Design a protein around this ligand. Structure first.
Ligand SMILES: *[C@@H]1O[C@H](CO)[C@@H](O[C@@H]2O[C@H](CO)[C@@H](O[C@@H]3O[C@H](CO[C@H]4O[C@H](CO)[C@@H](O)[C@H](O[C@H]5O[C@H](CO)[C@@H](O)[C@H](O)[C@@H]5O[C@H]5O[C@H](CO)[C@@H](O)[C@H](O)[C@@H]5O)[C@@H]4O)[C@@H](O)[C@H](O[C@H]4O[C@H](CO)[C@@H](O)[C@H](O)[C@@H]4O[C@H]4O[C@H](CO)[C@@H](O)[C@H](O)[C@@H]4O)[C@@H]3O)[C@H](O)[C@H]2NC(C)=O)[C@H](O)[C@H]1NC(C)=O
Ligand SMILES: Cc1cc(OCc2n[nH]c3c2CN(C(=O)OC(C)(C)C)CC3)c(C(C)(C)C)cc1Cl
Ligand SMILES: [Ca+2]
Ligand SMILES: [Ca+2]
Ligand code: NA
Ligand code: NA
Ligand SMILES: [Zn+2]
Length: 803
């Protein structure tokens, strides 16, 4: 209950929110049913519209009007945004030549340049080019400021997950807003687009920018706007707040537009109807920039023009129905549309079985347009699993499609032609970023980057310390003229041992066998074991181990490794393959060869008997025997210290990557450096498991089974230089392949590996940073490059989408 008969007199769009049941005058009052009786009359004035005309110039102030054209309006801070243009012979901001803003040019009493976030819903990245003729204000921000060709949203590419990621720097799994609709089984409560539960603070985790600002003494304007407040009034309210006295004036502001998303749903991303919504958004930008210019703030404020996600062509006829796959469709609840999430309809049903639902959904139809996953098997790049609000069963829907439970859900709900929510690497889901202002660079293009990075930068722009988040602070320093954040490399926590030869062959009883059999070249083999080829194979220094553990560096002719005495296998294995390298096979006599490593005790080694006994598990090697530099060097590849546990189904993938794809990449990239290793993430939190979290071992042993295997593949960005003699910037691609006992994920897996393996690997593309979280390792410690540049490289994601 709100006693809605106090008054908004003088309080319109007040910044502090008053406590119930005294009535409210802030932009949230509408959605709470709590506005004072006179809120519309006083606060939502519309008389005479939003623009000055020639006859209004110098008028007598009429407090009824939406905005003013009277001589007193500038000092009141409430002129129509075109006032100086119509009445004072000034130009529109968009008609001025752009001039570098080398320093903030701010009115006296401004402690820092304000930040304005101008967010546009559903603004697909290609609109910047495709709509540029009808968006002159946006085009000027873009060409004159700092822009990316696109910005990658988070998954799912829905509104609330992405806007809250913008505000927090967090993955949806960590901030808690994991979709537009959610069931939280601890609360036993549902979050919906329509309704009131969604305002409850228990849904919203992390620390959003407005809270980070307030805690640190920086005042914030509201970020939420009630849908019924017109855009012109939102802009005028921001401009009014900017005219407050110093002690009262916010430093950070947000504008939000529901367009072009709203129309894109109805007409598709490029429907002819889409031109008008784009013109209208450009006009609003024009109003803001003209307003800033009037207030002498247009070379003082940092403006961020940013979208939450793009928009794809989707219609009703492109819907798959679970009723065509499942007998038991009435015992499930589906969250439907551009992603699927499945749970039991009733928690009393103990005949509900996720295993049988997954199987009934797997490769059942020749062109099936969704793929089911247990959430922990989703590509790790999605970071979409560690939250009780994310259902165990997930469906990744192909772009352009929907999933629904039954056909009646679709026609008792064709309306629409656009939708979004798909995999965040899909081109149609990409969105926009432009930064314009004294703190951003002038006329500068930056590579595409992820929206999880922006929180840190907005904190930098406001002199705030960011709360802990998923950005990599410093990775976007190249966007900024100043206020850079100068990170330092983390300290290594564990230093390696460098074992020499310490064990005789007969001390080992591992049940392994190998068919293995000159003074000049004897010194040669010794030098290799001490590290003589290490500068060839370890190009960027050894990775640093950032947790407490016991490990050995092991050197070889063809590869170097960091061998974990605790996990009984390398944490990492590093090797370089030049353009000229040759692929050989595993000779017949060496097919089943595993060799004890006389540097590493029996007690800290794997054994072959464990693999013999484990009928499900086989093994592979991290440095591949196929790429040995010579027949004699090939023996090193069969050391028990190079062996890792692999399901036979996974070995099909691994053997093809190692025999075919590494050489292909070296040919294409002019040499590659490869770092490969295991990952253990049994609790799917995206973070390295400790030893007491491992759920599975090679039967009868303490050999832990990896959940995933990674590789980081680096070469010279200037491919005219070989990987091992690179003078400048690096180029990287990486993957984190799920270590699965079947290839059910790949529907064409009965075919030759040349038809499906590389497709699987692309799906599981990764950032080096993702691998760092999963392993507690820190790569690229010794390069010629600046640390911020290396941070950008570590956040790079190779997407395999075309242009
Ligand atoms: C992306 O960036 C984020 C942010 O940096 C990273 O997330 C952090 O990861 C840490 C490790 O997982 C985690 O640290 C834990 O903090 C616990 C205290 O947590 C509360 O306080 C913080 C601080 O204000 C708050 O942010 C938390 O908010 C979470 O939970 C609320 C309410 O549930 C949600 O509203 C919110 O959305 C958020 O949820 C997310 O995180 C939680 C985990 O905290 C998940 O469960 C959710 O699914 C969701 O993803 C909290 O309110 C603290 O309790 C932990 O301490 C345990 O472990 C340490 C190890 O050092 C040990 O010393 C202790 O023994 C202790 O164990 C005890 O509890 C165990 C479990 O019950 C039990 O088994 C033991 O026997 C013990 O009793 C731990 O230190 C940190 O909170 C989050 N922060 C956030 C915001 O998520 C994230 O990792 C990054 N992602 C990647 C891939 O890099
Ligand atoms: C820029 C920005 C805007 C924003 O909400 C804007 C907004 N106003 N009104 C609506 C929305 C979103 N939808 C419902 C109607 C949010 C939130 C508060 C969503 C977390 C964060 C940021 Cl960073
Ligand atoms: Ca949206
Ligand atoms: Ca983990
Ligand atoms: Na076996
Ligand atoms: Na298959
Ligand atoms: Zn939408």
């Amino acid at each position: 209950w709100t006693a809605t008969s106090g008054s908004c007199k003088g309080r319109c769009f007040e910044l502090q929110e008053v406590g119930p049941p005294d009535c409210r005058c802030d932009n949230l009052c509408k959605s709470y049913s709590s506005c004072c009786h006179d809120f519309d009359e006083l606060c939502l004035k519309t008389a005479r519209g939003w623009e000055c005309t020639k006859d209004r110039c110098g008028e007598v102030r009429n407090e009824e009007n939406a905005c003013h054209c009277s001589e007193d309006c500038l000092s009141r801070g409430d002129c129509c945004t075109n006032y100086q243009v119509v009445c004072k012979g000034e130009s529109h901001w968009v008609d001025d030549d752009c001039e570098e803003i080398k320093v903030p040019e701010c009115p006296a009493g401004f402690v820092r340049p304000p930040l304005i976030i101008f967010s546009v819903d559903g603004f697909r990245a290609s609109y910047m080019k495709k709509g540029s003729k009808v968006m002159p204000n946006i085009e000027k921000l873009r060409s004159c400021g700092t822009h990316a060709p696109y910005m990658r949203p988070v998954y799912p590419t829905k509104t609330f997950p992405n806007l809250y990621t913008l505000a927090t720097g967090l993955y949806p799994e960590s901030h808690g807003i994991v979709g537009n609709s959610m069931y939280d089984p601890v609360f036993d409560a549902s979050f919906h687009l329509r309704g009131r539960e969604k305002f409850n603070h228990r849904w919203w985790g992390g620390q959003p920018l407005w809270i980070t600002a307030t805690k640190q003494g920086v005042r914030a304007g509201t970020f939420f706007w009630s849908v019924s407040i017109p855009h012109e009034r939102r802009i005028l309210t921001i401009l009014q707040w900017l005219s407050l006295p110093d002690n009262e004036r916010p430093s950070v502001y947000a504008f939000y537009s529901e367009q072009p998303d709203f129309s894109g749903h109805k007409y598709g991303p490029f429907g002819p109807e889409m031109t008008n919504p784009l013109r209208e958004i450009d006009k609003t930008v024009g109003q803001l920039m003209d307003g800033l210019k009037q207030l002498r703030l247009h070379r003082c404020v940092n403006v961020i023009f940013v979208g939450d996600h793009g928009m794809e062509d989707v219609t009703c006829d492109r819907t798959e129905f679970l009723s065509n796959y499942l007998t038991n469709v009435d015992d499930i609840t589906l969250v439907p549309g551009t992603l699927g999430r499945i749970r039991a309809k009733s928690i009393n049903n103990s005949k509900y079985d996720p295993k049988t639902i997954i199987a009934a959904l797997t490769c059942k139809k020749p062109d099936q347009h969704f793929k089911p996953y247990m959430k922990q098997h989703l590509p790790k790049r999605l970071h979409y699993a560690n939250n009780r609000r994310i259902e165990d069963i997930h469906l990744l829907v192909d772009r352009r499609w929907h999933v629904a439970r039954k056909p009646l859900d679709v026609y008792k709900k064709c309306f629409f032609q656009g939708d979004h929510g798909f995999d965040n690497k899909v081109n149609s889901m990409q969105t926009v970023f432009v930064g314009y202002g004294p703190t951003f660079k002038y006329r500068t293009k930056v590579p595409p980057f992820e929206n999880i990075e922006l929180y840190n930068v907005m904190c930098d722009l406001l002199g705030l310390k960011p709360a802990p988040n998923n950005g990599t602070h410093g990775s976007l320093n190249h966007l900024l003229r100043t206020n850079t954040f100068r990170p330092t490399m983390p300290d290594e926590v564990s230093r390696p041992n460098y074992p020499g030869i310490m064990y005789l062959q007969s001390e080992f009883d591992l049940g392994c066998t190998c068919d293995d059999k000159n003074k000049l070249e004897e010194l040669n083999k010794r030098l290799h074991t001490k590290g003589s080829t290490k500068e060839r194979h370890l190009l960027y220094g050894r990775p640093a181990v950032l947790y407490r553990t016991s490990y050995d560096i092991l050197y070889h002719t063809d590869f170097e490794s960091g061998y974990s005495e605790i996990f009984l296998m390398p944490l990492w294995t590093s090797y370089t393959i030049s353009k000229q390298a040759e692929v050989s096979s595993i000779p017949e006599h060496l097919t089943n060869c595993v060799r004890p490593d006389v540097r590493v005790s029996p007690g800290f080694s794997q054994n072959c008997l464990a693999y013999k006994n484990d009928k499900q598990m086989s093994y592979g090697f991290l440095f591949p025997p196929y790429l040995s530099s010579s027949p004699e060097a090939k023996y090193d590849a069969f050391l028990v210290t190079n062996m890792v546990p692999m399901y036979p189904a996974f070995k099909r993938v691994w053997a093809y990557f190692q025999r075919v794809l590494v050489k292909k990449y070296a040919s294409e990239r002019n040499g590659v450096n490869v770092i490969s290793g295991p990952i253990f993430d049994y609790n799917y939190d995206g973070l390295r498991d400790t030893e007491d979290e491992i759920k599975q071992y090679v039967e009868g042993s303490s050999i832990p089974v990896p959940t995933h295997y990674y590789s980081i593949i680096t070469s010279c960005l200037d491919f005219t230089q070989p990987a091992d003699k690179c003078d400048g910037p690096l180029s990287v691609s990486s993957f984190i392949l799920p270590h699965r006992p079947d290839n059910d994920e790949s529907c064409n897996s009965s075919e030759d590996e040349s038809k499906w393996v590389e497709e699987l690997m692309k799906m599981h593309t990764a950032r080096v940073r993702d691998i760092e979280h999963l392993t507690g390792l820190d790569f690229y410690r010794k390069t010629s490059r600046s640390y911020s540049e290396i941070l950008t490289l570590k956040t790079y994601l190779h997407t395999y989408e075309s242009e």
